[PDB]
Amino acid sequence: PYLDPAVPVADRVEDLLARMTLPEKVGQMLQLDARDGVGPAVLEKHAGSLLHTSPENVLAAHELTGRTRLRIPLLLAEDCIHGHSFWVGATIFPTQLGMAATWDPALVEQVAHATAVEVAATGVHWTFSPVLCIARDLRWGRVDETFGEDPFLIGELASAMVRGYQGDGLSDPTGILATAKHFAGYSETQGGRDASEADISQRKLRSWFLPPFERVAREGCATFMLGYQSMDGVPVTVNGWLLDDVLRGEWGYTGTLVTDWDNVGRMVWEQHIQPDYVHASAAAVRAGNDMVMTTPRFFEGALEAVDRGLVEEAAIDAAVRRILTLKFRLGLFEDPRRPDVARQQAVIASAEHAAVNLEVARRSLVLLTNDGTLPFAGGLDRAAGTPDGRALAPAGAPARTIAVVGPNADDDHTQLGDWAGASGQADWLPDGHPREMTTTVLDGFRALAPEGWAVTHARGADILTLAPDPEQVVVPAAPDDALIAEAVAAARDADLAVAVVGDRIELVGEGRSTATLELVGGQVALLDALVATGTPVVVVVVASKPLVLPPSAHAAAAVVWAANPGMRGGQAVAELVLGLIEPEGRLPISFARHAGQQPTYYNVVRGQHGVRYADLTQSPAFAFGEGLSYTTVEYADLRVLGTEHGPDDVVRAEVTLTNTGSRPVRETVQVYVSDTVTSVTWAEKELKAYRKVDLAPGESATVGLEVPVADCTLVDAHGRRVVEPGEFELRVGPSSREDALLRASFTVAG
């Protein structure tokens, strides 16, 4: 009756519990690295799930499920972080950080739905995405995986990811399981280091880290993944307050828990908080973990531990019931969702996914400075009716030369970013994705420049080499005079130098936090040399995360932030520089002037004696929310409609935008709420709403804005999130800069 598709879900559970040995129950809780060997994992360890399953291993795995005793269908899971990361011909979208600059949840939902379509066609049921970590220390190596530094915007974009992945539910053939990842606090640890200690109190976690996670818990995220880090001395894997009080108790979450990579084992060898594997296993079960990821010795460990009474098997059964409940709900015992090669050739890298990718890439680029040089030569047009052709030479500019230079100008691996292609986590595509699927900046300019223009190229700098540890280690490359001289010569015979700079994979991700936030290698010397030629320089930053830029970049003619823009990124950069699209992106994260300047996120807590460091301003180099267009927009008449509010009312306001320049714009209006006096220290302001507004040149619009009063909360001492009565200020404008915000007062009372 456990194969009986009419017997309801709950009965086939203790039925299949009754036919499971104990080694197979402990197995059902496992998720093993298939890159080792699907044979041992499905057979000798009776695994309930596999990850990192190469295309040859996936078909193999279904085949071993047939030779087994009860043939329980596996959950096949993969990191599909921004596209189907490790599938040779898949659409690789911008990173999560790049996507956040669109401020566009509807588009991000499209990205997630396009990714799931491609993932399910390869037989994977479950992605470890989205990432809800909040980017509060820029030294952290995994900032590229976040949606930036704001909890409201993170929850907006992560909610859109979860919707797009999971589709119409557990029966949808192109729906997959999403994962709310790194619950919680993993992004802000000592020194910006990877999985160092998170000095994070319960109130601080509640204040800045949990809101996005609570949002997607209640919207139905199928699974949650536990972070690596220890918080207040306790690894999250055994943190009962977070897993029991908060996640199960307060929020009533009913989805499945998975640990991160060998969380259980690291309690022994890396945090040194468990003496041995038998007790790590026991503690993990006690804490309420459902799925245990790549701690293979949890098999023997969880078995020896039930065998000596440390954990009673009535708990090993607590997890296996919630896991198998998920498997029955998906239909996996009657349709295990095998890879479909005909479906793969129809949908993977289809034209409709490349068009989603192109749109996200174009909207994600942020123009940060512009002295008038852009749009180049005044802006180009394509031939009328040809939305895909070369630009035509513009009136008054028949022959221009564009020199495209810098280490990232023609580097498609860096442009795709971490968790994609050859980034390192998968060993079955060490060439990466096919080069012809990625348009680099150099490619974009060669494809789009008019027939009569020239595009030249010069590497101008190297970033790094690798060396053995002067007790594997990054060695920054020297400035190289001949390499710089060749780029300076190209710039001097050019009308425009496009310098593409940033980081690359050895300076990014797990175990690869950075201290300086600076450009490594010869890049600074190259920027200095280019700018000193007097040819106008556009700096294009292709990088995982905000970097301290040298003074030569602030003296450059324009600066564009591209944040790992995916496969179509280089086309988007050229279209922006040439005026073939209007800039739309807005920063989801702030830029420090120096690593010692941190914290530089916009919602810092009221406090301080002083306003500046004695050697340095506290103003960020670029603030959350900014980004130019190719026009001007004036914000005029901010007024609240009705200034009194009760606790479950809505704050309604109006503001008036006028496009006072010559080009259309899609403007991103940002609504911040400031709680003027608080009974506990709080953020000076917090983002609560935003609106995109389309304006033709000369057009005015009066825009309605609203914020629920129930979102104007703070977290009191004791951890209750409450609306506290009194005065508030509504602040509305084109970024988080105080000198760019209009302000209107309002009141909450009882």
Give yes or no for residue 355 binding a second copy (CB under 8 A): no
554 or 594, CB closer to a second copy? 594
- Say which residues have a Cβ less than 8 Å from residue 169's Cβ, sequence separation at least 6: 175
Shortest Cβ 193–a second copy spacing (Å) = 5
State residue 293 phi and psi, 5-degree precision.
-95, 125
Candidates 21, 68, 171, 190: give the one binding a second copy (CB under 8 A): 190
Distances in Å between the Cα of 617 and the Cα atoms of 147, 556, 612, 614, 685 are 26, 21, 5, 8, 20
Shortest Cβ 140–a second copy spacing (Å) = 11
The continuous run of DSSP H or E covering 157 comes out as: helix 151-166
667, 696 contact by CB (below 8 A): no
Give yes or no for residue 747 binding a second copy (CB under 8 A): no
Shortest Cβ 366–a second copy spacing (Å) = 24
- Judged on CB neighbours under 10 Å (0-12, 13-18, 19+), 454 is middle
> Beta strand 75-78 with 49-51: parallel, antiparallel or unpaired?
parallel
203 or 663, CB closer to a second copy? 203
Shortest Cβ 376–a second copy spacing (Å) = 32
By rule CB under 8 A, what string of x and - marks binding of each residue 638-677 to a second copy? --------------------------------------xx
By rule CB under 8 A, what string of x and - marks binding of each residue 109-148 to a second copy? ------------------------------x-x-------
351 or 614, CB closer to a second copy? 614
659, 631 contact by CB (below 8 A): yes
423 or 533, CB closer to a second copy? 423
Give yes or no for residue 310 binding a second copy (CB under 8 A): no
195 or 655, CB closer to a second copy? 195
Distance of CA 734 to the CA centre of its chain: 23
> Beta strand 464-467 with 473-476: parallel, antiparallel or unpaired?
antiparallel
Q: Two tokens at 268?
A: 């022994």
- What order do you get walking across the sheet with 558-561 strand by strand? 366-370, 558-561, 537-542, 496-502, 401-405, 454-458
141 or 565, CB closer to a second copy? 141
677-716 binders of Ca ion (CB under 5 A): 677
Query: Residue 691's closest CA among 658, 654, 660?
Result: 654
Give yes or no for residue 675 binding Ca ion (CB under 5 A): yes
188 or 443, CB closer to a second copy? 188
Shortest Cβ 680–a second copy spacing (Å) = 3
475 or 677, CB closer to Ca ion? 677
83 or 235, CB closer to a second copy? 235
698-717 binders of a second copy (CB under 8 A): 715-717
364, 101 contact by CB (below 8 A): yes
Task: Using CB under 8 A, count the residues that bind a second copy.
Answer: 76
Shortest Cβ 729–a second copy spacing (Å) = 12
Helices (H), 639-714: none
Distance CA 492, CA 485 (A): 10
Shortest Cβ 565–a second copy spacing (Å) = 22
Candidates 451, 615, 648, 750: give the one binding a second copy (CB under 8 A): 615
494, 458 contact by CB (below 8 A): no
Shortest Cβ 192–a second copy spacing (Å) = 7
Query: Residue 493's closest CA among 525, 454, 450?
Result: 454
Give yes or no for residue 254 binding a second copy (CB under 8 A): no
Distances in Å between the Cα of 236 and the Cα atoms of 231, 254, 658 are 7, 18, 50
By rule CB under 8 A, what string of x and - marks binding of each residue 677-696 to a second copy? xxxxxx--------------
Query: Residue 488's closest CA among 534, 442, 556, 520?
Result: 534
657, 667 contact by CB (below 8 A): yes
Shortest Cβ 197–a second copy spacing (Å) = 4
Query: Residue 373's closest CA among 538, 599, 615, 580?
Result: 538
Q: Which stretch binds a second copy (CB under 8 A): 124-132, 273-281, 291-299, 567-575?
A: 273-281
Candidates 21, 201, 254, 345: give the one binding a second copy (CB under 8 A): 201
DSSP notation for 173-222: TT--B-EEEEETTTTS-GGG-TT--B---HHHIIIIIHHHHHHHHHHT-S
Give yes or no for residue 213 binding a second copy (CB under 8 A): no
By rule CB under 5 A, what string of x and - marks binding of each residue 204-243 to Ca ion? ----------------------------------------
- Say which residues have a Cβ less than 8 Å from residue 112's Cβ, sequence separation at least 6: 129, 130, 160, 161, 162, 163, 164, 165, 178
385 or 511, CB closer to a second copy? 511
Radius of gyration of the chain (CA): 27
Candidates 16, 116, 200, 405: give the one binding a second copy (CB under 8 A): 200
- Amino acid present at 601: Y
Q: Which stretch binds Ca ion (CB under 5 A): 32-40, 168-176, 601-609, 671-679?
A: 671-679
Q: Which stretch binds a second copy (CB under 8 A): 169-177, 403-411, 601-609, 650-658?
A: 601-609
Task: Using CB under 5 A, count the residues that bind Ca ion.
Answer: 4
Q: Which stretch binds a second copy (CB under 8 A): 4-12, 186-194, 385-393, 426-434?
A: 186-194
196 binds, among Ca ion, a second copy, none (CB under 5 to 8 A by kind): a second copy
657, 636 contact by CB (below 8 A): yes
488 binds, among a second copy, Ca ion, none (CB under 5 to 8 A by kind): none
Give yes or no for residue 513 binding a second copy (CB under 8 A): yes
33 or 518, CB closer to a second copy? 518
User: Which of helix, strand or coil describes residue 488?
Assistant: helix
Candidates 250, 313, 480, 506: give the one binding a second copy (CB under 8 A): 506
Q: Two tokens at 691?
A: 């609106």
Distances in Å between the Cα of 683 and the Cα atoms of 475, 537, 689 are 40, 38, 16
Shortest Cβ 610–a second copy spacing (Å) = 4
Shortest Cβ 647–Ca ion spacing (Å) = 13
Distance of CA 9 to the CA centre of its chain: 35
375 or 509, CB closer to a second copy? 509
Q: Which stretch binds a second copy (CB under 8 A): 8-16, 344-352, 371-379, 510-518?
A: 510-518
30 or 195, CB closer to a second copy? 195
605 binds, among a second copy, Ca ion, none (CB under 5 to 8 A by kind): a second copy
Beta bridge partners, 574, equal none
709-748 binders of Ca ion (CB under 5 A): 724, 726
724 binds, among a second copy, Ca ion, none (CB under 5 to 8 A by kind): Ca ion
Residue 44: other Cβ atoms inside 10 A:
12
Distance CA 361, CA 564 (A): 9
Shortest Cβ 731–a second copy spacing (Å) = 16
Beta bridge partners, 123, equal none
Q: Which residues bind Ca ion (CB under 5 A)?
A: 675, 677, 724, 726
